[PDB]
Design a protein around this ligand. Sequence first.
Ligand SMILES: [Cl-]
Ligand SMILES: [Cl-]
Ligand SMILES: [Cl-]
Length: 457
Amino acid sequence: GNNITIPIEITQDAFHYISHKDLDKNIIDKYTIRQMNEYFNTQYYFQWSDDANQNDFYYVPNNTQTKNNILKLENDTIRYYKERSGYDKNYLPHTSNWVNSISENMNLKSFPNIPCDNHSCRGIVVNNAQVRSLPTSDAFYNNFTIPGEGYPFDYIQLSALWTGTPIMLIHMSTDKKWTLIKGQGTLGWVPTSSIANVDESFITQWKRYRLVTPTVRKQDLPIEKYDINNKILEAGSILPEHKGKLKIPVKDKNGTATLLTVNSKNLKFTTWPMTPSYKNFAHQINNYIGMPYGWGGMDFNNDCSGLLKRLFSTFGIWLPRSSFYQANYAGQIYSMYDQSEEQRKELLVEQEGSIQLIPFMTLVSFGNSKTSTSHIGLYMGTTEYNHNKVAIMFNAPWGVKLVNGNNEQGRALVGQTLITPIGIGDAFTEGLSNQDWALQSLWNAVGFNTTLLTETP
Ligand SMILES: [Cl-]
Ligand SMILES: [Cl-]
Ligand SMILES: [Cl-]
């Protein structure tokens, strides 16, 4: 082998993990969701605020522990790939100079080259966009025969941003085909055709509309008589609605956004934020199960942290983009680095802990050192599995690490969003060991943390 599939372990229905008496309840109360929704609006609209600028980028808006100089990050990214060999989108070795043409097109000597007088660089996403660390659709893969490498691990791929996302326009490539933007806690390059600037009137009118959000993962927007293409509406989008018809921003001939009314008779959406009931969380969780794992949002399929950010956005609860920032900045992190497997299971299974964990409101994160994270999921409580009570989580994992007798690595592949035991694949440890593969249990991760969400920053 090397990459070895493992079966799905537990029932793929969030309602299996919700007691009947909780069905009709909300997970958090009115006061708490109001505070979370206010925080969401501050973070989500930060690029339209007077506080934001074209030089500084925050993984968590207004938290200066997360502040970065954009030009430095751009130069760091160029340097990172100039210094490396890898493989392209067709699995062919990159030419030795392939970054040079990209660096030229980035034209950083003119940074930032999009003027911003009267806040004219405020903008919006008009087509769902794959945010890229460099302005190229070409990939950077490590050797695709190495477990954990090849597709979907294109390291240029950073995030998936949905139509409607408030952004700021920073800098345009020399060929004008790419624009460097920031929004939703992400910085990077997108096709220029996927974004548009917005004017003061656009923002004023945006704030007067009722907003809606889709209730299914993907759906097709109507193709009108003169449309050239179908458009896909993705869960997580937040868009105006008037008289029951969705409005979507489209790029006008002058490059600015204007709202277009969509014929909405067959569309599936609801007023945003969605009510944070156990029922609604269950429906939304169920809609993501089976979505392929997409590193960095590759091909509009989410990764571990992107899945959670997306789910919570439907409810007006804001998480940062990546697992480390979620674990450390969505709440007060509790590190179990100094605690044994037995102690970790005592907390998550029996709730024997110094703290109280909350199903559907606690992130569990895992990593290879005390402070780093390489996986995250949403704690969902416990279930009976193989006549044992096990802790469970909603998550998007790629695969669990395996090691053979020669200390070579492998993966027990999952590759899709699922509800899983915390110890993904632990049930298969004995069978794997008989074929000389030792599964590295998530319960034994060097870094292992819980973060409650119920405290808004
Ligand atoms: Cl920012
Ligand atoms: Cl994403
Ligand atoms: Cl487990």
